[PDB]
Short mmCIF file of C-alpha atoms in Angstrom, two decimals:
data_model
loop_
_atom_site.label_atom_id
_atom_site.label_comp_id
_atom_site.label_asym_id
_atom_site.label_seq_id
_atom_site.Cartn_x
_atom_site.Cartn_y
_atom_site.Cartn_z
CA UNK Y 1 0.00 0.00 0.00
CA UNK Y 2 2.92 2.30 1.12
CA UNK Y 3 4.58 1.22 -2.36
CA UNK Y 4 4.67 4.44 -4.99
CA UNK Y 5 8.19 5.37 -7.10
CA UNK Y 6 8.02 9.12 -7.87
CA UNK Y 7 9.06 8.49 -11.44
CA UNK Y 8 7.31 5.32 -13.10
CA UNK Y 9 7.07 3.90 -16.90
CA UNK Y 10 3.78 3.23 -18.76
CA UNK Y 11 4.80 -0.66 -18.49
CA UNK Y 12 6.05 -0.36 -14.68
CA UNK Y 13 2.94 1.80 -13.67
CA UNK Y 14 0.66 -1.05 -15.64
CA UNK Y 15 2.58 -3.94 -13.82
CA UNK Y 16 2.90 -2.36 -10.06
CA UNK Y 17 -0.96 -1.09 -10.11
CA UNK Y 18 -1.60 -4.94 -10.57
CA UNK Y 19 1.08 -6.22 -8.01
CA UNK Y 20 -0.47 -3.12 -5.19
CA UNK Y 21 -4.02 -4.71 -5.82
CA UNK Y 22 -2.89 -8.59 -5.02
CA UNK Y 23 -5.78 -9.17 -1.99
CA UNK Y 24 -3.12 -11.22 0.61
CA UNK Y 25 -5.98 -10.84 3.26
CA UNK Y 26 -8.09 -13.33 1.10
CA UNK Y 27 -4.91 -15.86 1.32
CA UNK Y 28 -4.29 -14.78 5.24
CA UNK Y 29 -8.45 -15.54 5.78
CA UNK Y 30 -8.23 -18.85 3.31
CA UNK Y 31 -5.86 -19.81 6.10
CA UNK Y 32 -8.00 -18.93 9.09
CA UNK Y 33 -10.78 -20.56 7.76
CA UNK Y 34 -8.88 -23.37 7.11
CA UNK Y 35 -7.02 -24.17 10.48
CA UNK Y 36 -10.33 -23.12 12.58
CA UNK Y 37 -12.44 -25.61 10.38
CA UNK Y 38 -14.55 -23.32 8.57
CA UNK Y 39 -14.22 -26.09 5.90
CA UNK Y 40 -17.12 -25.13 3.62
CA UNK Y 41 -16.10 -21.20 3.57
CA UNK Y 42 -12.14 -22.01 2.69
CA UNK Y 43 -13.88 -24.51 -0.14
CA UNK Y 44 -15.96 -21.12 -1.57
CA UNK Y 45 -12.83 -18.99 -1.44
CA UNK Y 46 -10.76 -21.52 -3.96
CA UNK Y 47 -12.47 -20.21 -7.01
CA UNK Y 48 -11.36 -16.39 -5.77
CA UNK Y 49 -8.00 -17.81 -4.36
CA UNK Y 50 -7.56 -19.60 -7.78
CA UNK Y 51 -8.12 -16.26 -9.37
CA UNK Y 52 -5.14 -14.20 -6.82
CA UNK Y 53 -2.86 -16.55 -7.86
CA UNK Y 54 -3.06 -17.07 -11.36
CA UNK Y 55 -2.72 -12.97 -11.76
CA UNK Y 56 0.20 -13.26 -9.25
CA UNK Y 57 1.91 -15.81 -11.50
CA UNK Y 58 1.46 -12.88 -14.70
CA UNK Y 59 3.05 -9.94 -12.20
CA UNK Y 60 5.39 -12.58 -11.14
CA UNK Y 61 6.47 -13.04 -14.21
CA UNK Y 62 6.58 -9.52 -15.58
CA UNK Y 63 8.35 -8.54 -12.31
CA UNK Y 64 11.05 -11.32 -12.89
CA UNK Y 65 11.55 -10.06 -16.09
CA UNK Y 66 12.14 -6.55 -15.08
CA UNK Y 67 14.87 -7.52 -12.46
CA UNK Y 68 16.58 -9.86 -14.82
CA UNK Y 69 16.99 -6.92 -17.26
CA UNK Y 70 17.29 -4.89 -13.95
CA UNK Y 71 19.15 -2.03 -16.17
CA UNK Y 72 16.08 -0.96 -17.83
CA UNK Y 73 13.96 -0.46 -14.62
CA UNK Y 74 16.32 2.34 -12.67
CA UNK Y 75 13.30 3.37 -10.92
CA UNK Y 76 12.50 0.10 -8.46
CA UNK Y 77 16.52 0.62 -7.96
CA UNK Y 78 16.19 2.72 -4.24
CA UNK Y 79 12.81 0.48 -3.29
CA UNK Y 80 12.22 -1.51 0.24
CA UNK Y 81 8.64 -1.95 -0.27
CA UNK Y 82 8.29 -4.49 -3.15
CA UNK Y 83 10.12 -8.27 -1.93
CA UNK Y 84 10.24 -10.59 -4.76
CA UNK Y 85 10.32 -13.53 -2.35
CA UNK Y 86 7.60 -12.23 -0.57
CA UNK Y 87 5.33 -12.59 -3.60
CA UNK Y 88 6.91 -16.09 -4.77
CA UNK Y 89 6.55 -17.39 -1.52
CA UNK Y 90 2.84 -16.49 -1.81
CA UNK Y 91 2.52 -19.00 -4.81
CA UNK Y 92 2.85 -22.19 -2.96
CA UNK Y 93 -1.12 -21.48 -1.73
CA UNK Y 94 -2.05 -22.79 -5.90
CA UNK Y 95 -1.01 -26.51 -4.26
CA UNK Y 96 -4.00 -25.79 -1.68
CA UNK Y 97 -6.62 -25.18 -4.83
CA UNK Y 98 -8.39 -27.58 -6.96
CA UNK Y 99 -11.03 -27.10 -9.80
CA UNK Y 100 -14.40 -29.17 -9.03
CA UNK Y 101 -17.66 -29.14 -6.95
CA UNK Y 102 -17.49 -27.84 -3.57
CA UNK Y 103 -17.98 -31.72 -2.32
CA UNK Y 104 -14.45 -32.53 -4.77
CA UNK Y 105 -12.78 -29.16 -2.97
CA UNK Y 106 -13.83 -30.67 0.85
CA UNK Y 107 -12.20 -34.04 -0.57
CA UNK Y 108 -8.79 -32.21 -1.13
CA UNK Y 109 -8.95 -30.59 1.56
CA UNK Y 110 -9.22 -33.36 3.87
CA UNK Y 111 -5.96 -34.93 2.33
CA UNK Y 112 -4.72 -31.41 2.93
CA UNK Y 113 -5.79 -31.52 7.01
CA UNK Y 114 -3.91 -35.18 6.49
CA UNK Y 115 -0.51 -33.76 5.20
CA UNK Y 116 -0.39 -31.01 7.76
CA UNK Y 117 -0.70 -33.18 10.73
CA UNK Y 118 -4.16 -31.70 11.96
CA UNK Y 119 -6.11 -34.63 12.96
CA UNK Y 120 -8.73 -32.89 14.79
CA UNK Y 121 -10.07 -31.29 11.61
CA UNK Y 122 -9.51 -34.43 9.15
CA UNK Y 123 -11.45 -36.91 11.27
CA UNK Y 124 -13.75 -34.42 11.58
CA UNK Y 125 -14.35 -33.48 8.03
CA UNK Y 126 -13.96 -37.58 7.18
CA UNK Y 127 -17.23 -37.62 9.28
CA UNK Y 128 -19.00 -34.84 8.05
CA UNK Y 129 -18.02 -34.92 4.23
CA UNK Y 130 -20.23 -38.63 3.57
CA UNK Y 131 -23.11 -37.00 5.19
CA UNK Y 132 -23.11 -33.95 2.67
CA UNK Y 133 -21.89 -36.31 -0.02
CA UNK Y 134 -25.05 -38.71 0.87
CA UNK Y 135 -27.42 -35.25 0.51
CA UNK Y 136 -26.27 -34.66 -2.72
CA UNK Y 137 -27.18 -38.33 -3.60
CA UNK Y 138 -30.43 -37.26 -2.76
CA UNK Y 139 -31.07 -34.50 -4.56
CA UNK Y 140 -29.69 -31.94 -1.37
CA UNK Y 141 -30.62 -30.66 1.65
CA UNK Y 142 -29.51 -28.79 4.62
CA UNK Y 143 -27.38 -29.96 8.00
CA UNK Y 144 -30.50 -29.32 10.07
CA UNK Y 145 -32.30 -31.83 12.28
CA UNK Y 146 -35.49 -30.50 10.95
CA UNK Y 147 -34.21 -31.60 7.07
CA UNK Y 148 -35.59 -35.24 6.72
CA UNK Y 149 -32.58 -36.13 4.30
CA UNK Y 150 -30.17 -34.87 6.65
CA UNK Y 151 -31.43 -36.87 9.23
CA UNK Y 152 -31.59 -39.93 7.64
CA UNK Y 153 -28.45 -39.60 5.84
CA UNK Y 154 -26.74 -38.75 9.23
CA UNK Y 155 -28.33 -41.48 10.67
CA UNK Y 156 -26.87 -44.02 7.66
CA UNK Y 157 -23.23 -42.42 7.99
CA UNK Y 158 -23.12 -42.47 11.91
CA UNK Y 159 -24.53 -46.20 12.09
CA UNK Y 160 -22.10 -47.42 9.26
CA UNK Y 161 -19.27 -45.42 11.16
CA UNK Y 162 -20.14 -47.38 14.54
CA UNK Y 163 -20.13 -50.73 12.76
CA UNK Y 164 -17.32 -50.58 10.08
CA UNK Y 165 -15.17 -47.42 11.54
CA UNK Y 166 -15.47 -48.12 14.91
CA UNK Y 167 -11.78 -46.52 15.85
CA UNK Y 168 -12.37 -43.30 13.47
CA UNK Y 169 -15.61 -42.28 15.69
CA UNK Y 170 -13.22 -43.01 18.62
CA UNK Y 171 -10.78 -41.12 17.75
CA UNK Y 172 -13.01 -38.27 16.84
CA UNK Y 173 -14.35 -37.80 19.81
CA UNK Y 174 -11.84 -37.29 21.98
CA UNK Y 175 -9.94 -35.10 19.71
CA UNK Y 176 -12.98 -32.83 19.77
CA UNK Y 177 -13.25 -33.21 23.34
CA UNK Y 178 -9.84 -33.28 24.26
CA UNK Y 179 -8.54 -33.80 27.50
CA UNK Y 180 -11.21 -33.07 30.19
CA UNK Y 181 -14.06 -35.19 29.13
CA UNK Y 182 -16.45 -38.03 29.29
CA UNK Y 183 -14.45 -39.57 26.17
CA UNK Y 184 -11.50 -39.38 27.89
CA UNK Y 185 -12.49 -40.05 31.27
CA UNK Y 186 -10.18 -38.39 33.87
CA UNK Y 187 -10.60 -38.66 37.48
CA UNK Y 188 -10.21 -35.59 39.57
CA UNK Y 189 -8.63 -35.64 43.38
CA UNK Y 190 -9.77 -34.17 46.71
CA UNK Y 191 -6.16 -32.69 46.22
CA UNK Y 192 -7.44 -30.85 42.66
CA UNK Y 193 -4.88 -33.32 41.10
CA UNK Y 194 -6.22 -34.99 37.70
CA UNK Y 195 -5.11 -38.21 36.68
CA UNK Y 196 -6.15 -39.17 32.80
CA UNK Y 197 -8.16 -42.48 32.58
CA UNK Y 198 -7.32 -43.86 28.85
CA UNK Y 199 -4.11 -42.05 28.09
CA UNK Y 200 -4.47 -42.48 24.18
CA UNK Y 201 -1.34 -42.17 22.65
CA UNK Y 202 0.81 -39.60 20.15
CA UNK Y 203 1.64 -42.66 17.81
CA UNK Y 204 -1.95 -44.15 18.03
CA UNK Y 205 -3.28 -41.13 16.50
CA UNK Y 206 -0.81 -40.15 14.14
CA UNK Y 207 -0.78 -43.73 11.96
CA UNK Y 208 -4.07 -43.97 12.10
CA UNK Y 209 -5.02 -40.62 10.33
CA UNK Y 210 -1.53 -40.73 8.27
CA UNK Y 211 -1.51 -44.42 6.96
CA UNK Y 212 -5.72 -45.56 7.24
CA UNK Y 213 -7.81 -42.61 6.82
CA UNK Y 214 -7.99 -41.49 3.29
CA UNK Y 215 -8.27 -45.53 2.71
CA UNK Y 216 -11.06 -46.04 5.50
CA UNK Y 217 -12.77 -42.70 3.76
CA UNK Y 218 -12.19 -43.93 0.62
CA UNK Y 219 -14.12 -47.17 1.46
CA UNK Y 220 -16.89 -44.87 2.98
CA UNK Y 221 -17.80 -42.72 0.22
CA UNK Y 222 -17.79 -45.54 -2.06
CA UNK Y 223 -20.01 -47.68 -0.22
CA UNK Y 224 -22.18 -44.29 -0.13
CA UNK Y 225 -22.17 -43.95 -3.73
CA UNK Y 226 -24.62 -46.90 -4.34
CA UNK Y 227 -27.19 -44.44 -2.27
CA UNK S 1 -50.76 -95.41 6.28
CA UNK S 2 -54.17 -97.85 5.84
CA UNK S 3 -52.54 -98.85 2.60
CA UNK S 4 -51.46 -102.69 2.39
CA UNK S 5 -52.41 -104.85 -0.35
CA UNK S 6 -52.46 -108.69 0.97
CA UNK S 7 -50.71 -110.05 -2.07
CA UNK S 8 -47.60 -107.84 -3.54
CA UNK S 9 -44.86 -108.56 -5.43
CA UNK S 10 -40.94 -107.66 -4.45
CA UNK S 11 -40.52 -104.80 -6.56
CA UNK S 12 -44.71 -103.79 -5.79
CA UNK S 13 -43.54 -103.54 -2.21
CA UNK S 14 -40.31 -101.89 -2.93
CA UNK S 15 -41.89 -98.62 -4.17
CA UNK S 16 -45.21 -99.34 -2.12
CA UNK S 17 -42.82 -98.86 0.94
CA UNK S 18 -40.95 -95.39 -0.57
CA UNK S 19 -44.48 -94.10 -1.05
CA UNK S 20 -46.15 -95.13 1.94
CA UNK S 21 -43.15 -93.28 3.71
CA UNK S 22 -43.50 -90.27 1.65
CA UNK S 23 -43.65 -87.30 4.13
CA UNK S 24 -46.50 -84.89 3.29
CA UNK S 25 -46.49 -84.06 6.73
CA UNK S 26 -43.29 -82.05 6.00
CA UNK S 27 -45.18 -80.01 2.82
CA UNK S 28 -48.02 -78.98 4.96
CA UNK S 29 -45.78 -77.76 7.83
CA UNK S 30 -43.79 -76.04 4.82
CA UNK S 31 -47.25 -74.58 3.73
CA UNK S 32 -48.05 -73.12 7.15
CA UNK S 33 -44.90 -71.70 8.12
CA UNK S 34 -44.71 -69.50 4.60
CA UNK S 35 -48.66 -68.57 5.41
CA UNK S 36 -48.13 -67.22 9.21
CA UNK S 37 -44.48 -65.65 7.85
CA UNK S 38 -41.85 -68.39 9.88
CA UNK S 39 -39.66 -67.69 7.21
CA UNK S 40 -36.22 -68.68 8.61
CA UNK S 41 -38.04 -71.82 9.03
CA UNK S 42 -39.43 -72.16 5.78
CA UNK S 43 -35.94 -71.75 3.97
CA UNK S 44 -34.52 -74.51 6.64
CA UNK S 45 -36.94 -76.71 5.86
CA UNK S 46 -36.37 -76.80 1.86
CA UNK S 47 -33.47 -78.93 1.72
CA UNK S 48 -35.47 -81.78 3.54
CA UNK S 49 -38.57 -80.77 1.39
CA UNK S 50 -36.04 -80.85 -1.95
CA UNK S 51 -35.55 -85.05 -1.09
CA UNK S 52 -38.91 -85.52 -0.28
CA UNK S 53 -39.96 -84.71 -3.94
CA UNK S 54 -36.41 -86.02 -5.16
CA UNK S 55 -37.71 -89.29 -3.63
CA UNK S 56 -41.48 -88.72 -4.89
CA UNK S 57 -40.24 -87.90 -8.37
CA UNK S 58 -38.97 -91.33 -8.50
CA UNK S 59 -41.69 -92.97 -7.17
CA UNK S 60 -43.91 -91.41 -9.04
CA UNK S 61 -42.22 -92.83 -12.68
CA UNK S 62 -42.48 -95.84 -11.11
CA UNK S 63 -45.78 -96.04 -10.33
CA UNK S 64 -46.61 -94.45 -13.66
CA UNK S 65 -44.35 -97.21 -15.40
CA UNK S 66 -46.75 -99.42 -13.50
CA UNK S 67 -50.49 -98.29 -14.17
CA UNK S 68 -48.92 -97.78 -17.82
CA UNK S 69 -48.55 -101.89 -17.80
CA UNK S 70 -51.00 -102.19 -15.78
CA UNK S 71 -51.77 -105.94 -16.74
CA UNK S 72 -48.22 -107.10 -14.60
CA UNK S 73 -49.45 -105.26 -11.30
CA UNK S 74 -52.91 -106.69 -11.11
CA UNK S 75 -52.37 -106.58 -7.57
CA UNK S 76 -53.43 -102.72 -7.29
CA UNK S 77 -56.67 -103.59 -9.42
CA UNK S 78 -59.17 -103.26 -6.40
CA UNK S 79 -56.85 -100.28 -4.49
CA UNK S 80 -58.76 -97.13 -4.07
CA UNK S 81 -56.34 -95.58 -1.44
CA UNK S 82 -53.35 -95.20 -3.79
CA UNK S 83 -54.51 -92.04 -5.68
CA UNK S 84 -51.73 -90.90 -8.23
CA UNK S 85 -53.01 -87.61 -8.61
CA UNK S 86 -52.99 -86.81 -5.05
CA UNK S 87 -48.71 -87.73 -5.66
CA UNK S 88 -48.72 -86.20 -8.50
CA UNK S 89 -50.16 -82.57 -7.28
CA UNK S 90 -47.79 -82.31 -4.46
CA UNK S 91 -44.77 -82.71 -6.82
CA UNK S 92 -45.56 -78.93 -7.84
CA UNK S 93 -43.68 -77.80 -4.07
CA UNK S 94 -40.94 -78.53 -6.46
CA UNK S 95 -41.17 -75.01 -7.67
CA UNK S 96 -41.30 -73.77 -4.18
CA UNK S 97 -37.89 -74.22 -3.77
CA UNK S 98 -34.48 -73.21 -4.28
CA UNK S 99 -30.57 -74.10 -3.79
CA UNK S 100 -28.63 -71.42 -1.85
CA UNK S 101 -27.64 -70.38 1.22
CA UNK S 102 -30.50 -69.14 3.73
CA UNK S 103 -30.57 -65.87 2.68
CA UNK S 104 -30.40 -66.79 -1.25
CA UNK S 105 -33.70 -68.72 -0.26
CA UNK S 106 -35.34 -65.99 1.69
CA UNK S 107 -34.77 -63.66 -1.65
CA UNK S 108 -36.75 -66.35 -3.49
CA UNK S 109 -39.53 -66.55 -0.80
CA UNK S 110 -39.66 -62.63 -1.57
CA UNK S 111 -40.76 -63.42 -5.01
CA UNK S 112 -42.95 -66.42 -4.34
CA UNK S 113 -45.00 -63.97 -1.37
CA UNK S 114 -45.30 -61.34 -4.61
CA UNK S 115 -46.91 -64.09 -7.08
CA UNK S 116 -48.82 -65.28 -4.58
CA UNK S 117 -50.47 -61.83 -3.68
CA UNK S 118 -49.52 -62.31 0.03
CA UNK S 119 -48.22 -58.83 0.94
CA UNK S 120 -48.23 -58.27 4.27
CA UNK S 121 -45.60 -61.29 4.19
CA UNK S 122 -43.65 -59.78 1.13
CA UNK S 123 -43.22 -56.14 2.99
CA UNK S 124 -42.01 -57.39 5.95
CA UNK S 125 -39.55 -59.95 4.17
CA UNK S 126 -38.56 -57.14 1.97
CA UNK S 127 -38.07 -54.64 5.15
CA UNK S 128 -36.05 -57.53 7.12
CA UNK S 129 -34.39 -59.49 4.62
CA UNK S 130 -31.58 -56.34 4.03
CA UNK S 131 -30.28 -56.55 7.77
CA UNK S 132 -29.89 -59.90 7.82
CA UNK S 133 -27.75 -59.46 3.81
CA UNK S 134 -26.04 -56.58 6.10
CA UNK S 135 -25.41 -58.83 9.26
CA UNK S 136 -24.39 -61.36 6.99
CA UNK S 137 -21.65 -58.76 5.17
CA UNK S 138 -20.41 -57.64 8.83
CA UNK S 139 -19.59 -61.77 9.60
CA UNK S 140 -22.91 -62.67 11.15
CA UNK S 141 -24.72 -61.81 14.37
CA UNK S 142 -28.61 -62.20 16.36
CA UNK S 143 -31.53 -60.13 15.48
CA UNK S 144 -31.50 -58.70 19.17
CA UNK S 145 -30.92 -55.18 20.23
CA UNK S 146 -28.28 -55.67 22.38
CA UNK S 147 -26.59 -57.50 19.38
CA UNK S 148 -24.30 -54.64 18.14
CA UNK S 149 -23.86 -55.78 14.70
CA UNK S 150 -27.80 -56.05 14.57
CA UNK S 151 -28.45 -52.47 16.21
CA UNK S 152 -26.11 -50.45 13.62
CA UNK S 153 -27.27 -52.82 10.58
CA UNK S 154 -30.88 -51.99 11.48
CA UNK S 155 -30.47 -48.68 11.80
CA UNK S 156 -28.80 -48.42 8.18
CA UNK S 157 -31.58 -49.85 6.47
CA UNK S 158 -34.10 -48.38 8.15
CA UNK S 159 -32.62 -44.64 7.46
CA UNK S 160 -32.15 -46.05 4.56
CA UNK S 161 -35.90 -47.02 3.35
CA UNK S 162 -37.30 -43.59 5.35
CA UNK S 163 -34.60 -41.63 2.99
CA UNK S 164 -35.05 -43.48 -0.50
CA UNK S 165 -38.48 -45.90 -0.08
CA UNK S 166 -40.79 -43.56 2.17
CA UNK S 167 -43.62 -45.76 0.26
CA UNK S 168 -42.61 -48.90 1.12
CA UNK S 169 -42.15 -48.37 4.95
CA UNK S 170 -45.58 -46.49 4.56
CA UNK S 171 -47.34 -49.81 3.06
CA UNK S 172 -45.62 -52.49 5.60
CA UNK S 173 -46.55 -50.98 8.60
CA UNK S 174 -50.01 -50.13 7.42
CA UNK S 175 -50.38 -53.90 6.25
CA UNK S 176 -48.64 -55.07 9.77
CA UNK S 177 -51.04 -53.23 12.23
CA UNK S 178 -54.37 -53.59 9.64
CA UNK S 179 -57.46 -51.30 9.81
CA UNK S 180 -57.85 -50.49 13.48
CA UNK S 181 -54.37 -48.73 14.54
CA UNK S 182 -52.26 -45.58 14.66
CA UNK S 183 -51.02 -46.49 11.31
CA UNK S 184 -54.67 -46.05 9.98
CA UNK S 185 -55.90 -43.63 12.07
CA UNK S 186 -59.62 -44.30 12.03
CA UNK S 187 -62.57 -42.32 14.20
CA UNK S 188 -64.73 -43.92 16.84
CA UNK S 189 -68.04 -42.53 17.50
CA UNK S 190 -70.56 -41.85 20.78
CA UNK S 191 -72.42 -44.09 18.50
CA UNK S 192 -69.99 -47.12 18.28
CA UNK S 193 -69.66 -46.04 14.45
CA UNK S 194 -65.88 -46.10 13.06
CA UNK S 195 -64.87 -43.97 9.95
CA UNK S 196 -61.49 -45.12 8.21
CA UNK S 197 -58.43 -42.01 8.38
CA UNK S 198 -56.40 -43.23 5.29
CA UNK S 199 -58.43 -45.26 3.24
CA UNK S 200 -56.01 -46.81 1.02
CA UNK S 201 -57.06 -48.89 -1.64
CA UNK S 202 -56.55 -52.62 -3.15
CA UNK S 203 -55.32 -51.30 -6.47
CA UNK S 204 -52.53 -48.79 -4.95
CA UNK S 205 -50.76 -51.78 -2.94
CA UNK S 206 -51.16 -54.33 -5.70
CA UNK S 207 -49.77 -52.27 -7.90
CA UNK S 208 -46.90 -51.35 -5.44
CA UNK S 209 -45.95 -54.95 -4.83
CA UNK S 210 -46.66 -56.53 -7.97
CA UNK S 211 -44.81 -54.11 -10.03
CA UNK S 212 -41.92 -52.42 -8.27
CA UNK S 213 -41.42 -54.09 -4.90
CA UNK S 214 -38.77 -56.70 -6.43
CA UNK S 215 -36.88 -53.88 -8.37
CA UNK S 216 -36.92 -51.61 -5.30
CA UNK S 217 -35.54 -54.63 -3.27
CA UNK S 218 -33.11 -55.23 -5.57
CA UNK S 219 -31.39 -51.75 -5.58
CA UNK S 220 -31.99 -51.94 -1.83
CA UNK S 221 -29.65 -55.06 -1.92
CA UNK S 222 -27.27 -53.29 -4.43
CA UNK S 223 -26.81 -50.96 -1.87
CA UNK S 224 -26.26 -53.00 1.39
CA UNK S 225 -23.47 -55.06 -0.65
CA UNK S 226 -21.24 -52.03 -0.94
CA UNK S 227 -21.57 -52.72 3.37
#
């Protein structure tokens, strides 16, 4: 915002004006979204995101260009403002994007919540995503317990869950829980010490989303297909 | 039983014995327990019933071999208790059955309870029959609710039918609890007069079962193998 050269070419002017108006608050909220679990609003924002980026690439490019034939383009020569690096380093967010249906963009991004290590919000989404994926099988609805189709298809996911995927519902749980909790079930001194009553384990947790979810999930949604 | 001709010959007696020992006992039972819906014990019974007629079948060209040179077996000219019709007609329970496991049979009950226009007993075989293809899919387990394997299973079809086959849920329990129930919701007067809630007619439910019960059932199925 701060960025302006006193003296700036017709091409320069054309490029920077693009490179001043790149919205990094849409990557910084993508983000948010993303690590709070606002799963269906980072899913909308891919098409905009997808959009940032691919303009980013063109400045990129033209701004690549201009340093590499740096003696043509005296006036960036005094500027702090404008980081190359910063801007490249803003790229890698195209490996969070895919093209598809907002169901296809949930399905990425739980392999994404998978690859980052954050198995709160992948078992959650591997629960949630069949329910909305059953829903569309049915023409759609809404996750309300007044929707018929959501409560049946809820009702189809959950039971399957508790008689195939026993240890993903488990695992969910607690996670969402954490600590102090019924699904944990801690026991609590006259001394206010706490001692924790199934003590599930780092390893446990981490195999089990890293090596057998996308396969368990896998198994789910295409068992739910045939709805 | 009060069948014994004074003089008979060793190959007379032979096949007088067989036939004399033939088990019609077992058809009748086999008759009744498809009527009042024992259908587990229907399907059990059809291996037993599938030698009866294996034996009766043979028997039977005997006999017929016999009456058709009738001048060698002159000992059966004054018999009026040996009727080969009354043989002959029970050798259609032949079509009654099936080879298969238990629940292969039970799918061919299905169809035999359509034909034969029974459908209180076709509704309720096409509502149950699913859990048991489920249970069966899961490695086995009890109809029982405390049965785990049973509760979940259950559940899934149920959801299931209430999500896709609203009508057919609608029709079995309307057929299950008859005229005077919640299912029907008929008016009773100061008078002792009662005025039907629902009315539904002959046509709609033939119609229903005839014609789309066995290709709903079969999707249904489609579905649960997936399980």
């Amino acid at each position: 915002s701060r960025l302006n050269p006193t003296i700036f070419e017709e091409e320069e002017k054309k490029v920077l004006t693009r490179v001043k108006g790149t919205d990094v608050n849409v990557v910084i909220n993508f983000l948010w979204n993303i690590r709070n679990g606002f799963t269906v609003n980072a899913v909308k924002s891919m098409n905009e995101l997808k959009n940032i980026i691919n303009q980013l690439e063109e400045d990129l490019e033209k701004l690549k260009s201009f340093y590499k034939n740096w003696e043509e383009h005296k006036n960036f020569q005094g500027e702090t403002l404008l980081v190359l690096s910063d801007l490249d380093s803003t790229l890698k967010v195209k490996d969070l994007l895919i093209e598809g249906n907002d169901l296809e963009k949930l399905n990425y991004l739980l392999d994404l919540y998978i690859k980052a290590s954050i198995y709160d919000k992948a078992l959650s989404l591997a629960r949630e995503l069949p329910v909305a994926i059953c829903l569309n099988k049915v023409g759609g609805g809404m996750f309300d317990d007044k929707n018929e189709k959501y409560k049946h298809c809820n009702e189809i996911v959950t039971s399957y869950l508790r008689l195939r995927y026993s240890g993903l519902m488990e695992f969910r749980n607690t996670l969402m829980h954490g600590g102090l909790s019924t699904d944990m079930k801690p026991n609590v001194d006259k001394d206010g010490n706490i001692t924790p009553g199934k003590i599930v384990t780092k390893n446990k947790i981490e195999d089990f989303v890293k090596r057998e979810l996308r396969n368990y999930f896998d198994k789910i949604v295409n068992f739910l297909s045939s709805a």
